[PDB]
Amino acid sequence: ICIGYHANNSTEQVDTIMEKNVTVTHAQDILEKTHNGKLCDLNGVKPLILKDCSVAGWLLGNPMCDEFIRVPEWSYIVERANPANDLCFPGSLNDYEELKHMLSRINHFEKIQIIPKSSWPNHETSLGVSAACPYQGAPSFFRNVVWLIKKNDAYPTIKISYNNTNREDLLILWGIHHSNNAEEQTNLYKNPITYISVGTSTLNQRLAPKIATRSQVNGQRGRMDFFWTILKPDDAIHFESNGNFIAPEYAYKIVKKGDSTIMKSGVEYGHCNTKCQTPVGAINSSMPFHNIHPLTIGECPKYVKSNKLVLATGLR
Amino acid sequence: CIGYHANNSTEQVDTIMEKNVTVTHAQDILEKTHNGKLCDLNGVKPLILKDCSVAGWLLGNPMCDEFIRVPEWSYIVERANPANDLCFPGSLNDYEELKHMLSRINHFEKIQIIPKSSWPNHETSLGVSAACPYQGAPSFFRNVVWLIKKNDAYPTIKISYNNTNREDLLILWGIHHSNNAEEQTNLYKNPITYISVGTSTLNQRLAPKIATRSQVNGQRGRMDFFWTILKPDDAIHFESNGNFIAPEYAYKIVKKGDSTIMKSGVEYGHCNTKCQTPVGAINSSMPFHNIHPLTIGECPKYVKSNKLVLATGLR
Amino acid sequence: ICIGYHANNSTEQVDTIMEKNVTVTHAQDILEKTHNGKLCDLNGVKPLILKDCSVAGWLLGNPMCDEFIRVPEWSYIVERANPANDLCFPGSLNDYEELKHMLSRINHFEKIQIIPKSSWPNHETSLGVSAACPYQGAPSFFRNVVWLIKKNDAYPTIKISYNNTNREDLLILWGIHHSNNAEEQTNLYKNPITYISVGTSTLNQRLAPKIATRSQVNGQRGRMDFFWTILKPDDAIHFESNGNFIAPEYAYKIVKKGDSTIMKSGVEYGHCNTKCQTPVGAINSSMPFHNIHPLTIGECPKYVKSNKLVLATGLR
Amino acid sequence: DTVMTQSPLSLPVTPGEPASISCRSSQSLLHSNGYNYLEWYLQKPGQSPQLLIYLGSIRASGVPDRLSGSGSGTDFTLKISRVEAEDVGVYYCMQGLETPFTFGPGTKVEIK
Amino acid sequence: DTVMTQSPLSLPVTPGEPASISCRSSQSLLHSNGYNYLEWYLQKPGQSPQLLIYLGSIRASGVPDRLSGSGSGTDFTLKISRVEAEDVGVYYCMQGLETPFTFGPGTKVEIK
Amino acid sequence: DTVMTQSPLSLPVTPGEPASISCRSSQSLLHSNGYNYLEWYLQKPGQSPQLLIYLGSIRASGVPDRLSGSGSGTDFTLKISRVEAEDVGVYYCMQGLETPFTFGPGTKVEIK
Amino acid sequence: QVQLVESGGGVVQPGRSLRVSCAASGFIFSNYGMHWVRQAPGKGLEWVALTWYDGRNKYYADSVKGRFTISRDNSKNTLYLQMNSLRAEDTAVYYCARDGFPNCISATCGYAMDVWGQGTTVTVSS
Amino acid sequence: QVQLVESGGGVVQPGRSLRVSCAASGFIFSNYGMHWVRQAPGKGLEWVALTWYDGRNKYYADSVKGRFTISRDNSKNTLYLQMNSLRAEDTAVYYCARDGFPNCISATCGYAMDVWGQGTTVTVSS
Amino acid sequence: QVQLVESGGGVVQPGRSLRVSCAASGFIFSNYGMHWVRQAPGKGLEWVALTWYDGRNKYYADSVKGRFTISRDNSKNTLYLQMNSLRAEDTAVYYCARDGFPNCISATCGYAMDVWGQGTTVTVSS
Amino acid sequence: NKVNSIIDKMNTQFEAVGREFNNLERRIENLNKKMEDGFLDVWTYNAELLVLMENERTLDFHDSNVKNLYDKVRLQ
Amino acid sequence: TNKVNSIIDKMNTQFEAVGREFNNLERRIENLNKKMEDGFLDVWTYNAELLVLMENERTLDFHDSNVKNLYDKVRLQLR
Amino acid sequence: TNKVNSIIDKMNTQFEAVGREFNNLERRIENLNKKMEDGFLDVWTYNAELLVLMENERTLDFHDSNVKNLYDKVRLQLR
Known about the structure:
Family (chains K, L): Belongs to the influenza viruses hemagglutinin family.
Protein name (chains K, L): Hemagglutinin
Distance between the termini of chain J: 33 Å
Organism (chains K, L): Influenza A virus
Subcellular location (chains K, L): Host apical cell membrane; Virion membrane
Subunit structure (chains K, L): Homotrimer of disulfide-linked HA1-HA2.
Oligomer: heterododecamer
Helix content of chain D: under 10%
Shape of chain J: rod-shaped
């Protein structure tokens, strides 16, 4: 007659409150620690790889970023650390870091021609180019905006309105130009005192240029500032200007909304499928914990900073 | 012979190894019941705004003329998506700070600071519009004055007010934005206007914005509004050449305490209680509840669970 | 034959989940509740004690705070509650609370003469004094800035640039002046319409004075505003003015970065050497908890809002 | 309640020279705004009254440029620069600070 | 696909008097932004064509002041104020809203 | 320390014709902000000295239009457009960039 | 133009009641306050009652408190005064008067009386 | 000045292939779109092909679909058309024309044709 | 006007001490820095010492280091020089001088010397 | 009778308050919402875990005391 | 016998971080964001580790306790 | 011996408060900061107190049990 344990000769270590290391027979791990180390698909929809461009450069159409003129549906956006192309002309985009919040909830865009380039019979849309945005060794400019310069030594006032008639929203961009001195201002445009006014059902704005002396960035001594707004299905947008105006030509239409994100990584692309994603790899496990990176997308196991989590289900 | 004091009656509790054990004398802690009306709080009656926003009461709306004089209160109730608000399109600068600082004020006495009969060389009558109608007739707000020319003239304005009380104040003014040049040369006369306001802590200058906009509520113009708080033994100064909406009344802070601004849609009912969730009321002693995470008064703690019973039994 | 406990006699009480006050043979405390109660050194480097000035007053050169012209390396900054001297002339400093965030990461400064006071042959730098900033019963002004007034009834336009050539950053300050009426403006300066322009590789700013009527503060009826910026180790800064200008003379060079903190207390100074500091004393204990004050500096034990904490290691 | 006293009860004048009247109160009729709440009325024989002056010194719409008023606190005064034959009647002094409005005894102006 | 009709096929009008031609489409040539995509061309006898009007109204560089176009939706018209002896040729209508571009039958102008 | 050398020791050139003197240092006297710390003085026979120029170029209050200076780095020069009979004296070159201020040997001007 | 008329006077013995009226034609009537004023024969003027524009709050004097009433009844442009417990000293003439500026929302607004009526006589006898 | 010249015509029997070329000089050739247009003898005008400024997207009509090809070549300023499976009804004259405004990044961008060439003849016989 | 006068010792034998003074009157004396300058009988000019406006920091040359001292003594409008361990070569003439601009808060400010005194003579003999 | 030991140990908690933000500050509204949701999620876990542990400690108590009353009469 | 699932069900909901961007003149909010995220992560890892340790202690108490009673239910009947 | 150190390292990480300043027109973010700091302090003090109580209970139980087992190693060794 004997009563006792069901012994064994395995090897595995667990932790308890008053014994630091203890041997067990059966044990089960919960913390995954491996990744495939490449960018994959997510439920069968390819992501968007901006490669060597920025979000602003894509939305404004850099001459060196012409591969993304038409873009299909995506799931998440990948952006490299420290882009190289960006905005060729020095300046800034007003209310930045808030447009990125408007993104990550849009999964598909559509492009619409709102004001044709041939609709300006009393201006000049040809010679407005600069050497800071070259295309194959020649001066160029953005492709979604028009820079207007006097024609026949004149610059009449502008009154332009656009009436929305679709069933979805829009996104419009426009800008201003800051000069260096009075002679340049009277050589590009003609009037010495200029302004811009924009109004809609919920926005009211007036602007004036600044003329001063600054340093050199990318070989230029001028500046440009850009703005954005979202238009409702039945509203309208109005424009009035006298100079220093960068007119809009294309607009983006929101057609699908959902869940997305913006990443920052430098991992290369690979042709494979997965259902969870991290900025340094992918996960194909069923355990409920991981310690790879706290930013994820999809359904993912929970995150902890530890590196050992095994619960004992054995004896001894 | 020794053994367990067996018993009967049915109730189940939760453990860490077993899920639905059976016990005898379990006791519950979660409360899941609420009466479903707006009630009183220790005697003082709430302020109920039926169809009127907070900005529409502090400025004075013609179709909101029953809150002209208001007694003390405990909390403010405001329906979701009001229907009166500001009849004339525009905006109130820093609205959410005002909706944050009204949450610690429990009484407002109303004071006349510039009488409407002290404008001998202007006009305070023909300043009406069809956007705010009173019984099918044009009308304006009741705490501000819109000034138009008289006899084809608009003299400059210099006015000061000195606080001689022991409590603070709250002053509101505004500016009018036109839509073209002929309207400006018709209502006012000077083409270039400005507004200056200066006190010991504030400095401000503004100019109108004439442009083209769309239609909201029938009109094609806008009006802005501002606010400040004047401290005892201090003065506020004004200066305008046009486009001025002058203040006439002001509010005096006379009591401070704890308050909240709810959003709900239940109906009033005469009762008494000592806690209030925005969708009902609580009268109990168990130290946990499940209804809503916003409250007022002293109320038990909040959790998201559905059952919480700790056992005191056998078996 | 005897098996039993190793009983003794003592007095000490510990807590338990189902008991409330039980006796133990010997127990070890963990919470610390004692502090020496004086401001004194940390790791051998002396702090900086502002007796009756503020952060703005020391960085602008208040005439009463003339003992802080040259300051050695420090560890943390001590400032009294409700300073007394502060800004003698009524006004404000733009983005004050963001400047106090850049500090607490700087441990040493060095002063540099960027524009000498002798470099203004056709202006006047003498009678720019006011009675609101006295020095030994006589009108005076700040020491790191210059107030310019007309000479021989004239005020020529100002064009000045400074080029950074060191290997560290800089911090510069300038300002604007608001008058009370037209007669004062035409008496101090000459041109009735004035402006200020400042430009660099990132900044772009233009301002105009405000003339109105306001109350009395400290006996005066005008105001002065102040600004600041950082210059990178290779950029340049440009200035342009026509009136109402407070030119800069001195600037600060950042030479050491590290850990620091701004405190508010009123405890007198003393001489010690410790490794932790709280605004109402110091700590010289090795226990892992305390309840003095939640804001500390250095390597200090944790914080809990409790009164008693004793772990039992006894019997009975 | 606030009593309002007015002197003299009678006042004979002749055309050509100015005249003055006074009205007194037992309380300070001065608000925090810096304005005095006191009025002036007139009733010619066999007719209805007619308002003269708003809060202290603001004239009405129709009164000539000869009538003016000035005072503060508890003493107020009316001044007629020149007297004609039309200016004959009774002049009353009225307060408006507290809810029960009170008039005064009045004063007659008889030519002589 | 979109058929384009153009009547009449002959116009013997000269000189001095005005003229008019018409062009009709089986769909609406109106964009969502309020502009019409409709063009006019001209081929003199024995050479290449030459553009006249881009959109429904905007002229070109070189076209005299006489020519002007107007219309919307489905009916379009070209009007010549005065006709000279150098305006003999064939006129064409072209749409540009769809991917395949389509011309029309044309119209001859002859001196009679 | 910084040795200041100034040549020559005698300039017998009067009157009417221009004149020039030079003083040179052993270190660079240029600050980090683009200014030179170099001064010029003068002592007439039997009296106290008198200042001429503060920085590299800026003149004083009292000196005539004739005197002017120009230089940078290590070499400096003073120039007189025309010489009168009252411009006799001794001219000194002084530096002020380092803590111990130093003068030079000076230069005498005599009539001939 | 702007005018006001009154009617309803007569002869009444002590203890009974009487009603007076005041009709207007001109300015909009639903945006102004109204007053009542008496004048005893041989004595001076006195003040009786005041009503707001809409008609919520009302005020009466002390020799009139709790004995007379005032009402507006818009859409017919009239005003009323109901007099009960008529004593002997209440013999006088009665006048209507409106404010000088619209929409008074306070007790003592600072506005005055601009347009006056003509007058109706009421006597107590026998 | 701005001019365009074309050459490469001749006589070709049914079957086989052919190639035509247009050469330009006077403006930046790498910023504009180009088109082809064909006119049969005794009939009107019709449309054939369209290409972009760089050369990615291309469009063809339904009567030359899948049987014709269009391509550019920079650094030499030439345009080519290759005709396979020649039928008998393709006897006509061919033209090459450009856009009126630069950088069209859509299929129908609203710009028109501004500059035209002279023309070449292609015939099918025997 | 602005003038500075100086009065001091006449003759001293080697090894002893001496005191010189310089009184100023005509401007504000508590806002400027001051200097001392020497001139040997037949040689050029040399520099001795300078002090600040309030009187904290001091600087001396290398040929007068340790033996000389300076002091301000405000509220009497004076300045002092004290010479210890006098040698034989210190026979010269002494001058007072002041800055051209107020409130110097650096060792090398850039301001120069504007106003000079007349001078006193000190000799070492026997 | 140890229920009172639970309320006092949970005497303090996180009380939510209402704040309003306009259309151009949506990156602080997310911060507020996430912080409130996180503090609500932390506190329920503690309550549930404490209830479960106390239930186990209560049930295994009575299952042990009956034995130590059994033996004090059994070993006689 | 199937004890593992009693762990994931308790930790169904946790804090999920999101990305936010701020410019160079609003650093006082970036510190708020970073501190909040780090604090939540610290709380959750502490909770998970403590739960694992306590569960292991109880599990090893289970088997060392039952063997005595399965021993004594076949021990004391024997005489 | 050496039980206390097992708790010191377990609470090696916590929340460190930092000083921030706001002006008169940004009260909302000041409330946000204050509430967050108070909540974190409350969570940590709750955790510490609960850990201490549980550790004390377990220590007392261990000290009560080990002597009984020492009695067991000798109870059945004789008669």
